[PDB]
Amino acid sequence: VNKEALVQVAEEVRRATGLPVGWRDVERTLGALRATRDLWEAVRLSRVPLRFLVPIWEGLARRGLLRVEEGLDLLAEVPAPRPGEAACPACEGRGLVGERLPGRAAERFLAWAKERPEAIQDFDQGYVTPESTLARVALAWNWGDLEGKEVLVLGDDDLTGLAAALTGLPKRVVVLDADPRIVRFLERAAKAEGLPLEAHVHDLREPLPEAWVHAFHTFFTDPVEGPLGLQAFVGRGLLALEGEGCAGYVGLTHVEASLAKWADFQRFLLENGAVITELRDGFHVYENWGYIEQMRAWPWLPVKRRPEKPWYTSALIRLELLRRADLENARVEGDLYDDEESSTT
Amino acid sequence: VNKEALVQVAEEVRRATGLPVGWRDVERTLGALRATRDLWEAVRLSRVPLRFLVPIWEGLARRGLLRVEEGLDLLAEVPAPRPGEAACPACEGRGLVGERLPGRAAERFLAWAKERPEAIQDFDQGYVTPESTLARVALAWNWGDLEGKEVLVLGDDDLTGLAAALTGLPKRVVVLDADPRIVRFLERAAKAEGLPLEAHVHDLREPLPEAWVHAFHTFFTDPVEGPLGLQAFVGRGLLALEGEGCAGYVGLTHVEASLAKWADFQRFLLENGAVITELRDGFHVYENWGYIEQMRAWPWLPVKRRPEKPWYTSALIRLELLRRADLENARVEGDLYDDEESSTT
Numbered sequence A, B: 001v002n003k004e005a006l007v008q009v010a011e012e013v014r015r016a017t018g019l020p021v022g023w024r025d026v027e028r029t030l031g032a033l034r035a036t037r038d039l040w041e042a043v044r045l046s047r048v049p050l051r052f053l054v055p056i057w058e059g060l061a062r063r064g065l066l067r068v069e070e071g072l073d074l075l076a077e078v079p080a081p082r083p084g085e086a087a088c089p090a091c092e093g094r095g096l097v098g099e100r101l102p103g104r105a106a107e108r109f110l111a112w113a114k115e116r117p118e119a120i121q122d123f124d125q126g127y128v129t130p131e132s133t134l135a136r137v138a139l140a141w142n143w144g145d146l147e148g149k150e151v152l153v154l155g156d157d158d159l160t161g162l163a164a165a166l167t168g169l170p171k172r173v174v175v176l177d178a179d180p181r182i183v184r185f186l187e188r189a190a191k192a193e194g195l196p197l198e199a200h201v202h203d204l205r206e207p208l209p210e211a212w213v214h215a216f217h218t219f220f221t222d223p224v225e226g227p228l229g230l231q232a233f234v235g236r237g238l239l240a241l242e243g244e245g246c247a248g249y250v251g252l253t254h255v256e257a258s259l260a261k262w263a264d265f266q267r268f269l270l271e272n273g274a275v276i277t278e279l280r281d282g283f284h285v286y287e288n289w290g291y292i293e294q295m296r297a298w299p300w301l302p303v304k305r306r307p308e309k310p311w312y313t314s315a316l317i318r319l320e321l322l323r324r325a326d327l328e329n330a331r332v333e334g335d336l337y338d339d340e341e342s343s344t345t
């Protein structure tokens, strides 16, 4: 197997699906398979969308390069790099450790996370590990985006708002979520701990209310990944920021977003006056959600076994505004949970 | 002292200098000074250009907010966050570690580093610590940008090329540098260790030779940071990549580049076919160079004592091409080593 084989597998998939699948996506697919035969692990190692993975694995099987039988087994020596093991074990490759946060935030957060609302399918929910929440908050601590600042959290299954509020740092934390279970849990924690934390039921398919426009120094979001998802979560965040000097924290996956779409996201940020100052790939590790068998991709999977360990991960982005973001504050139209590269909804 | 003072301090500096100095840079300046009396540590904690910090420190002193003597001491309570301390100590916040590299590369690189050429001012040199180099290469290993790949290094006081060769992963490594000392050291190492590693004297102000155009899968550079430096090094590197699916690794400082120049750099990348997949800020720690008292900024400093520990740092950026970059291969006109934001030449 040689380099042109990778090119032809991609073009074939590009022809069937209309999606931006290139040869390096095929290389990555094969590279992961050098290290694992487990489907979920292959996904984690690959950094390719699950929507691309399925037809690539099938194209590869058609050519006799891959055996699909209770696992994904390579049949040939391949022209693809093996995954390297360079990640720092002490911080799981993050570079940041939440244990270091003040106000004993890390230990107090673990107590709350034990009673957290379970992830549900209606809102594309699936929460990150506690260490991932605490480290995302620690990035914001390190960049001076918590202390004395007004913090907005757009969707909060991860409980970032709680973690941010437990540090003692923020002036206040406001959390928006469509799910009353998350709002109520946050309001129970706020009252029990004495935290300057409020939470409100709001569906981000509808415009951001005027109280929250240009009213915050810092936002966090781990959003749905459409262009619709970027209108519903990130565009709203940008509009919520007062302006120059305000910062945003954004989750970004490979599983549901290609590099062509990472580039569309980055171009959206740069054209609306922001700049990226951190992009830590693989920063968030997700806890397995209960509804995996009900997602769109499940019937497509070549091997179907419930995962037993984490496999879904995302990058953490920090952006900062160089000027005020005057974006439209419009309704989302179209199905937020049906992006063409989505798979876990 | 309210936020409007922060804005006035920035507006004065901006008006005096013509440079993009904003309120958040003044907040960052002050935030750092909450945490240290030491000028070099204040630079490291600030994330502000030294060309900015000098006049901000002077503007603060003029308003009776900062005492400047054998240390920098704040004279009032200030609305500025204290920088957080959540970096993982194990990997110095990078998330990556060199020790696991293949070929026993870490251990072998350390021994060659002991005899490295010392940094000279003629070429704006200043090498990162050995672990910074190794971690930079390890990021490339984790992203599959070394194994069976053709690697170009554009400038190499850091000896990234030797470190990458020592893994035994690349197909080959080509190093270009204007300094014959760097070239000759690499040749000797290549010969002694039997590595597929070659080095050539080349001045990046001149066109990339045709034999290196669109010839590589991976490049590394830690470049001079003007518009011009970014054209001589990064624009060359992009031209050197074959195209879609190829990777670049770029060092980018706060010390000599503002957030506005970071945003100009990011837009350059995105409009030339690239996408950022990693941006780890503060990844590289730099060893203190000999000619510090002959650098441009030295007479500007409000206190003048040799640094006893590291203070200059830079981000590590990973870019990937979504398509071929067809940039011009023209001669770079102007003064490479005299960018408006430069301070360490």
Ligand SMILES: CSC[C@H]1O[C@@H](n2cnc3c(N)ncnc32)[C@H](O)[C@@H]1O
Pocket: A123, A124, A125, A126, A154, A155, A156, A157, A158, A176, A177, A178, A179, A182, A202, A203, A204, A205, A222, A223, A224, A232, A336
């Ligand atoms: C997208 S999953 C991250 C979070 O955003 C929330 N979320 C998902 N969809 C919406 C929506 N349309 N409006 C508001 N919050 C949402 C979820 O309930 C979860 O806490």
Ligand SMILES: CSC[C@H]1O[C@@H](n2cnc3c(N)ncnc32)[C@H](O)[C@@H]1O
Pocket: B123, B124, B125, B126, B154, B155, B156, B157, B158, B176, B177, B178, B179, B182, B202, B203, B204, B205, B222, B223, B224, B336
């Ligand atoms: C910017 S310093 C990093 C490296 O680039 C090299 N360098 C600096 N200027 C040039 C140039 N004009 N052409 C090639 N290499 C350069 C230095 O010798 C060093 O090893």
Ligand SMILES: NCCCCN(CCCN)CCCN
Pocket: A124, A125, A126, A127, A128, A157, A158, A222, A223, A224, A225, A226, A253, A256, A289, A312, A342, A344, A345
């Ligand atoms: N469907 C469960 C996985 C959700 C991942 N995130 C969506 C990103 C892809 N569009 C939301 C996670 C919130 N913590």
Ligand SMILES: NCCCCN(CCCN)CCCN
Pocket: B124, B125, B126, B127, B128, B157, B158, B222, B223, B224, B225, B251, B252, B253, B289, B314, B344, B345
């Ligand atoms: N003048 C000494 C400091 C120069 C910094 N540059 C050194 C590059 C080689 N390691 C890098 C600036 C970041 N692009």
Ligand SMILES: [Fe+3]
Pocket: A088, A089, A090, A091, A092, A093, A094, A095, A096, B088, B089, B090, B091, B092, B093, B094, B095, B096
């Ligand atoms: Fe670490």
